[PDB]
Structure formats: C-alpha cells, structure tokens
Amino acid sequence: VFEWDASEDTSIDYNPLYKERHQVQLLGRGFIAGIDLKQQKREQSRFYGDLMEKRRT
C-alpha cells in the first residue's frame, strides 16, 4: 500500500478540547517552521496584537 489507510489515524477524539487544540501565539512574534510568515500573520488571532495596540501609547 503506497498511501496510508484513513483507519490508521490516531488523532480521533470525542473530546472537543482535544479536537480543538488552542494554538500558541508564541508571544505574537514566533512563527512555526515551514509556513510563510504572511499567512500566519493574517491567520493568528492577533489577541496579542490587540493587547499591544491597546498598550501602545
């Protein structure tokens, strides 16, 4: 079998907490390897960006 069967999947969870893993913002300045920085910037929730702009004097 060249490909892999879908039955081999281990990340099957009935718990929504594990189904929806809270993504790490990495202090709003870190970036996960591989993904282009622009896509992550426009994808990140920008909670830290909002906090920074609120605390920007």
The CB-of-6 to another protein minimum distance in angstroms stands at 13
Give whole-number Cα distances, 52 to 26, 27, 36, 56, in Å: 14, 11, 23, 6
- Stretch 1-57 residues interacting with another protein (CB under 8 A): 2-4, 8, 10-13, 15, 17-18, 20-36, 38-39, 45, 47-48, 51-52, 55-56
Cβ contact 47:25 at 8 Å: yes
**What does the binding site for another protein look like in residue numbers (CB under 8 A)?**
2-4, 8, 10-13, 15, 17-18, 20-36, 38-39, 45, 47-48, 51-52, 55-56
